[PDB]
């Protein structure tokens, strides 16, 4: 199995499109993509480095497929693993709940032993509140393909460089 397991959910495809950009950005072929509508909870056991991708749905909720997997995470042993988070979200439509989902996921996985890496500055986003907030920073990369599509490629470039360091790749 490849070094990095990237587990994403999507309804309208934008999280999946970002996921593929992230995979490519690593340059070297070190990522396997998993759609969580199709994946099993035990697939996470296969990787030391995890990337978790999730948009926020229904105003502050986990994406439906990630909702399903989340209820199965209380058993999984994340101890010693390193975990990064990315989300797509809409900071103009949902200013009070922007990227809530990666914060919900990170709260759960960090409690199970998985160490968060790849925190991301909140600079250049216009939002009011977020469960992904971690003191000046989001728990992971915030993408917005609704409002800031023109910023996605450069944000991914910069974030992947950071993760490569954290994963020692
Ligand atoms: C009804 C609905 C509610 C949403 N609520 C939020 C929200 O609470 N926070 C947020 O950041 N984005 C919210 N969004 C925007 C989506 O998260 C954003 O469009 C995301 O890219 C969709 O991902 P997908 O195309 O992979 O399904 C909402 C979108 C819809 C249609
Ligand atoms: Mg405990």
UniProtKB/Swiss-Prot annotation:
Query: Which keywords label this protein?
Result: Electron transport, Flavoprotein, FMN, Transport
**Which cofactors are required for activity?**
FMN
One of the record's GO molecular function terms: FMN binding
Q: Which residues form the Flavodoxin-like domain?
A: 4-164
**UniProt GO BP:** electron transport chain
> Could you name the domain of life of the organism this protein comes from?
Bacteria
Main function: Low-potential electron donor to a number of redox enzymes.
Concerning its family, UniProt says: Belongs to the flavodoxin family.
Q: Which PANTHER family match?
A: FLAVODOXIN 1 (PTHR42809:SF1), FLAVODOXIN 2 (PTHR42809)
* Protein name (record): Flavodoxin
Species of the source: Nostoc sp. (strain ATCC 29151 / PCC 7119)
């Amino acid at each position: 199995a490849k070094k990095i397991g990237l587990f994403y959910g999507t309804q309208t495809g934008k999280t999946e499109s970002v996921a593929e950009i992230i995979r490519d950005e690593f340059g070297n072929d070190v990522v396997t993509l998993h759609d969580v509508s199709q994946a099993e909870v035990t697939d996470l056991n296969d990787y030391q480095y995890l990337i978790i991708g999730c948009p926020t749905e229904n105003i502050g909720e986990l994406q439906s497929d990630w909702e399903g997997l989340y209820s199965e995470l209380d058993d999984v042993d994340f101890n010693g693993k390193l975990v990064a988070y990315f989300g797509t979200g809409d900071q103009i439509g949902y200013a009070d709940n922007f990227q809530d989902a990666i914060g919900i996921l990170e709260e759960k996985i960090s409690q199970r032993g998985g160490k968060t890496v790849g925190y991301w500055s909140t600079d250049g986003y216009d939002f009011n509140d977020s469960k992904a907030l971690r003191n000046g920073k989001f728990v992971g990369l915030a993408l917005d393909e609704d409002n800031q599509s023109d910023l996605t490629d450069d944000r991914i470039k910069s974030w992947v460089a950071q993760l490569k360091s954290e994963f020692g790749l």
